[PDB]
């Protein structure tokens, strides 16, 4: 049971990072190098969720519920991967001269939507592992026994 | 620890737990599987959704609802909707829960027999209960006296009871509900130019019968009202950006209702199935039951669905008799409410089904408890 | 080792690394060979010439495409330019690594099965996958559904993906792209007379086509306006030291993807592709790609053809949804970049064409798997 | 006077008189305008080409079906036809004949209503009426009990009637018939190389699919031994004088009638739409219509059709039940031969709509008579 609530503070963190994203697209032009930094981080911090919903899954023996969880966590080595590339694109594009005010523009959203389509990925692999943890708890005692009420 | 009631209905499920006013969890009971080709590495990969996540990515699968006519046809697709009812919607392990299950009247007993081997050797539940749907319903409006009108998604049901008694010689069952208007209004709309025919687009249709469609109190007046003005009309928009405009199926979807020759069925309709229900009883009771018509289930939900009952039955009635129609607010979840009220009844602990009694006696204990 | 990337389109040859931000090599993909008399002893003795040594040499070769409209013709060519990119721009042994190709949807079979027996055969890699282009130009992107518009030199082809599933009965391909563009050009520039006749000065006109063309975001307000003022002149000087003046034939060139018939083709445009595209897809869909119109390939990097496909879409739209192009700076190679992500999963892995596999099942086992 | 009995159909129009036992006139229903440039004087000015002049002219034309899926789109080319079939093809003037005009069930209401006006208000026919398709292709076969099968160009519907009643709750349309067959093998003719685009190589596509198009009896065996065998290839000139080659596209053509799946639909085939059909009629009449299975049109006119539906409605049948399928070999014509028997009728002479009642109910009079 100690590896179960380890993922509700390993998706936390990723909270604060998206939080952290969402303030700079705020700002100018001076904020955007910090931007891709912030975004580098992000696939790195999805890497250490799908690193150990892993480890639930080889502790659930509902073959209904470890057969869920790896069908909705394979998602997040496509989308962190596609984010430290995208991330590297980016990074160089800035290097040109005048590009404009409206190009840097959307390169932030194409920045922004993946790491919200990452961010809502790694959401719905700790739902199907919160259900993981009712099933390793009861397997392992911990089970209230009903009892009849006397008239 | 608290009793679950789950209300699988042939098109929602109505979870929650035993005392409270409200079903936590209301989702549709489908089961979506896709269709198309997974190209993409990673991504494709899920074989089945179940829930809302089943009705939001329908554009891509095909939908199947596991239970038709109130009868568990798919019961493969039946313990995912019950595994996610369970562990996904209401996050609690069954083995600490006893769980009060519904049923229509008139069913099969294979039906019955079936998800209480599920729930006693899937789930390993402590306890369990099959009520009637009807019953419930009589629960849930503060009454031990009325005839219940219950129309959901498959059947359409009548039970009688006179002061906590049933008469089961009276109970009529009709298999026309709300998918089968469903399936009306779809094949009515090719009169306009409109087309539905995937599974998805079936769920589209249903979201325009809730929100268009109404129940005409003078049926005939309205198609010739129809016809000569256009302040019948109104406008549906749909998930492309397309305006649809219906004016004539408003009210011709809810007729089937009152007259099922409209998809050649030869019974009788809604109004006439209640009063032959009435005239089958004792004539000692017959005054209290027209005064106690008790409306429940999702497809009484139509506007002027009790004006159009109260016209018909006081025109059967014999003129002297008082006909009133309860149709409550809370219609939709008349089952559930009165489903947690009998799970809370501290006379109810004596009556449930443990699983050591099942152990002597197999499924067949259903059947000589409920 | 790393995986090898190898876009092998019609006009140029993006080749590099799996896991990097750019391709290593690009180069035309050409194959010169001379049409002169080498009356110099010692030197004039090479018989052909493939990369950027075909492109500096051009006034003394004939210059020929391996590929035309995606389908490779010449395949004795075709393994000079593998052999090229190879030991002479990547300077790697194939035997090492891994090679991802791509390939246009819709292509003929023997193309894909012949280019498994020159990459297992003749250049022995010890795996290979090919991969649909549009499908890689998502990965690019961040998206994980959209339609995309891939338009190269020979290909321009939609494919609509939503959730990492493809429609594949709604992808459309249609061959105009821009070297039929650059015909057009070289044609309406006798109106002015400017004659380029041979192989070489084809190249000449496609990088007038590359500097000085641009889209009209009305065809017929600037079919006036040139001929009102000479404020759209031009002027671009040639290899010889000429000086021409084009004003005219700067946004009548790339008019011909909006308006095919100025070629003699019955086809659509292609925002009336990308429209009957997104209609043949699912209702509940349709919505999702109207947002996501991903632009790919060299031939979408003109001025203003971005803003002439949101004009035009939305033209056809039902007038409630919202119209998004996504057009990177980054069009050119987002085929390379997407199949540098797509070779560094980890996913991925499980999903190459082993040279094992393929002694087993011979060039058929490509059809299976990609 | 005679009757007039005319057959739009969605590819093709079956024109004659009402007695006779085959139609006179027999053309395609298409429309051709030129898309070139008219460089001679004198010759090329006529503006529209419409029966089988389109079809011969049809290199410098483009071709327009004014019908799709059963529904008249074009009304202003839809004009052009009927003044062909009637000027120019059967040479009648239309104010001194009644017309029988046939329809597809199940299609929107003003398809009917503006057609009559056409006939009434243009043409200036003296009566006219318009009768279901499905129902005069039992006329045509000598019976009056059985389920019909009719599949031309645009719509496959089922229609069950027993002893001159019709069933129409039961009664089944799809939208996938003979050109939703041309476009699919216009798909699969790409993986052997072969690029058909134009819509007058549309028509060519056609004759393939007419002349080495089959149903196999087993699918998978088929598929089996197309790839192990070069018998089942077979060779057709092209008008060009090239020479295509096709072994697989022959039975995978047709077997989207039978897995739908194959252009992306959701339906089922034809032998479960058949199927269904029956399960949705009444218990007693259903051994009448398993031994009486009419199959009517064009695109039921595959090799092995027939013996390909008796294999996989025997696999859904009780197996008690005989199932026989009636194919005449003059399917192609059975719903005008039926249309003739019905307008020779004597009963039938006072069910003509008339130009008087015409002008004192307007356009609606067609649905209360028809
Ligand atoms: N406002 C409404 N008007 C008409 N029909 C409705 C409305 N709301 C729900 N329905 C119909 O009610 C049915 C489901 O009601 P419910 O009693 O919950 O079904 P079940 O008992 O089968 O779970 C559906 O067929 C739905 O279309
Ligand atoms: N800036 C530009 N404007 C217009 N056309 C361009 C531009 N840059 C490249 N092209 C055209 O793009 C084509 C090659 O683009 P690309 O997609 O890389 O080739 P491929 O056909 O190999 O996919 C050539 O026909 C070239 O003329
Ligand atoms: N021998 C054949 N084999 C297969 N398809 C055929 C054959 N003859 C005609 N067809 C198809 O039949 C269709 C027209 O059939 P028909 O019923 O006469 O047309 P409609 O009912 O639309 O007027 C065309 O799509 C044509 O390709
Ligand atoms: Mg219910
Ligand atoms: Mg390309
Ligand atoms: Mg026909």
């Avoid at chain 2, 294979?110 to 319903?137: C, D, G, H, W």
């Avoid at chain 2, 006296?145 to 009871?161: E, K, M, R």
């Avoid at chain 2, 009952?309 to 009165?338: C, D, F, H, N």
Wanted: glycine share 6%.
């Amino acid at each position: 049971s100690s590896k179960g609530n380890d993922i509700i503070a390993a998706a936390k963190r990723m909270a604060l990072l998206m939080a952290e994203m969402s303030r700079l697209v705020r700002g100018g032009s001076g904020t955007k190098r910090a931007l891709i930094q912030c975004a580098k981080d992000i696939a790195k911090a999805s890497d250490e969720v799908t690193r150990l919903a892993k480890e639930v899954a080889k502790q659930c023996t509902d073959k209904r519920i470890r057969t869920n969880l790896l069908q909705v966590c394979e998602r997040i080595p496509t989308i962190s991967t596609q984010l430290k590339i995208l991330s590297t694109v980016k990074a160089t594009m800035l290097g040109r001269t005048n590009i404009s005010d409206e190009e840097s523009e959307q390169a932030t959203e194409m920045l922004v939507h993946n790491a919200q389509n990452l961010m809502q990925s790694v959401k719905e692999t700790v739902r199907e592992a919160e259900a993981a943890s009712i099933k390793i708890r009861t397997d392992a005692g911990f089970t209230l026994r009903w009892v009849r009420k006397t008239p | 620890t608290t009793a679950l009631v789950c209300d699988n209905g042939s098109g929602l499920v109505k979870a929650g737990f035993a005392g409270d006013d409200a079903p936590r969890a209301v989702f549709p009971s489908i089961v979506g599987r896709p269709r198309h080709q997974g190209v993409m590495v990673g991504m494709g990969q899920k074989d089945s959704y179940v829930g809302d996540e089943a009705q939001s990515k329908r554009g891509i699968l095909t939908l199947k609802y596991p239970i038709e006519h109130g009868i568990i046809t798919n019961w493969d697709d039946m313990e995912k909707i019950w595994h996610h009812t369970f562990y996904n919607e209401l996050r609690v392990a069954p083995e600490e829960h006893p769980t009060l299950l519904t049923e229509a009247p008139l069913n099969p007993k294979a039906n019955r027999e079936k998800m209480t081997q599920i729930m006693f050797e899937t789930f390993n539940v402590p306890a369990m209960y099959v009520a009637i749907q009807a019953v419930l319903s009589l629960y849930a409006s503060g009454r031990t006296t009325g005839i219940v009108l219950d129309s959901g998604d498959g059947v359409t049901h009548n039970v009688p009871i006179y002061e906590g008694y049933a008469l089961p010689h009276a109970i009529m069952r009709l298999d026309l509900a709300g998918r089968d208007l469903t399936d009306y209004l779809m094949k009515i709309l090719t009169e306009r130019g409109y087309s539905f025919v995937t599974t998805a687009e079936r769920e589209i249709v249903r979201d325009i019968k809730e929100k268009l469609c109404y129940v005409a109190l003078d049926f005939e007046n309205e198609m010739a009202t129809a016809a000569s003005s256009s302040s019948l009309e109104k406008s549906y928009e749909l998930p492309d950006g397309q305006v649809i405009t219906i004016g004539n199926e408003r009210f011709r979807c809810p007729e089937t209702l009152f007259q099922p020759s409209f998809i050649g069925m030869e019974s009788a309709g809604i109004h006439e199935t209640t009063y032959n229900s009435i005239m089958k009883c004792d004539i000692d009771i017959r005054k209290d039951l027209y005064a106690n018509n008790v409306m429940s289930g999702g497809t009484t939900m139509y506007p002027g669905i009790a004006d159009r009952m109260q016209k018909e039955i006081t025109a059967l009635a014999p003129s002297t008799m008082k006909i009133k129609i309860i149709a409550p607010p809370e219609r939709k979840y008349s089952v559930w409410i009165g489903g947690s009220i009998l799970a809370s009844l501290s006379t109810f602990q004596q009556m449930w089904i443990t699983k050591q009694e099942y152990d002597e006696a197999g499924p067949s204990i259903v059947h000589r408890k409920c």
